């Protein structure tokens, strides 16, 4: 009677950057979705393709827990059929996404006076990300016709950029921890049931 490790994902002391988002494969366990429904600062609990009140009555093959950090003005992009720097170049959700997205203001955790430059995001990319694609490449982005050859400068820029979360920032620029739960039911027997 193993319980699904949801505490390790939400109550994690440190989250990953959006460009290198972490994913926890959850399977063969008893899931308790009652711990999530009504939290304290849960700024977002939008579900797509499935209802929350029916998750306790559904069994799934694999449940993927994606966690990362973005700013408040970018949480609207963590949704099916969205465009922007986060959606196209960091974390993309498919159009037929089945699952829920959870976000909450973590200004009291991920913002330091002076700037928390530890969280990063991808600014430049030649093409858009496929759904659930993770690109951790740090190659010098070529914005011109002259080859870069790993030399930062003009028309050759580092593809990653810092957030610099300061506690005095506005709500939209404050850090938000996002947890995206994907519910998969493919060619498979279901093992992540509810109780």
């Amino acid at each position, epitope marked *: 009677t193993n319980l699904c490790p949801f505490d390790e994902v939400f109550n994690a002391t440190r989250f990953a950057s959006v460009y290198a988002w972490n994913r926890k494969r959850i399977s063969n366990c008893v899931a308790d979705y009652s711990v999530l429904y009504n939290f304290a600062p849960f700024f977002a609990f939008k579900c797509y393709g499935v209802s929350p009140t029916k998750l306790n009555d559904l069994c799934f093959t694999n449940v993927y827990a994606d966690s990362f950090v973005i700013r408040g*003005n970018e949480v609207s992009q963590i949704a099916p059929g969205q465009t922007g720097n986060i959606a196209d170049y960091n974390y993309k959700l498919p159009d037929d996404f089945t699952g829920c997205v959870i976000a909450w203001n973590s200004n009291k955790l991920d913002s330091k006076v002076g700037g928390n430059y530890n969280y990063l995001y991808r600014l430049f*990319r030649k093409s858009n990300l496929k759904p659930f694609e993770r690109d951790i490449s740090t190659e010098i982005y070529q914005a011109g016709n002259k080859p870069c050859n790993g030399v930062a400068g003009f028309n050759c820029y580092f593809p990653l950029r810092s957030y610099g979360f300061r506690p005095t920032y506005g709500v*939209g*620029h404050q850090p938000y921890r996002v947890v995206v739960l994907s519910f998969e039911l493919l060619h498979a027997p279901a093992t992540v049931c509810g109780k």
Partner: antibody
Amino acid sequence: QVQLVESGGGLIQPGGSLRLSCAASGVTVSSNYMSWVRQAPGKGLEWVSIIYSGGTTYYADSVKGRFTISRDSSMNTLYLQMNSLRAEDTAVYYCARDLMVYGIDVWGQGTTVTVSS
Amino acid sequence: EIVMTQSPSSLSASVGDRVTITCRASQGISSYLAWYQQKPGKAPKLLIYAASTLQSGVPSRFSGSGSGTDFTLTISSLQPEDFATYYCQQLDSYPPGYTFGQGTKVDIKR
């Protein structure tokens, strides 16, 4: 030679259509954030449209449904299709290379559009 | 929409003066701000990006400062080729727009 060269502007009646071109050399259009900025006589700069290197486009409210930004990678050229033009669209139109947090470093010389009856 | 209030609309300065132009955002935009210079009949010229970082090639007498809502462009020692019109820009993704300031004309004081 890093430059942006605009063309296609001119005089046109209200309701008509006009296509602006932005020939780039040095900067690869399909690899950058490319924006159109216009400036009416005596007024400030007004952002019009942007196209991400990945294909995402964005438009100002005053030009939504009327302007459509595009590009031809083989030509290394940025375009701005202006339909249902109005008098307030009279401005010098600049195409520019946007570096998001690093600013807008490369500007074109601008092409003039005049919409009047 | 974010409203960029820039003041003063115009200011008069002699060569060697310390000029200060102020840009105020309607909401917080952290360091997402840039400063531009434009002369009549020419394209804008990027001076400062990220509120306080000097663009390559721009003389060191230019400097930007501030974060959040209040920003200032500073010309420590005005030179003859600095009489122009200066704009601030909210170079931030949300909320769309990318708005510019009303602009500040710096004419010759006599």
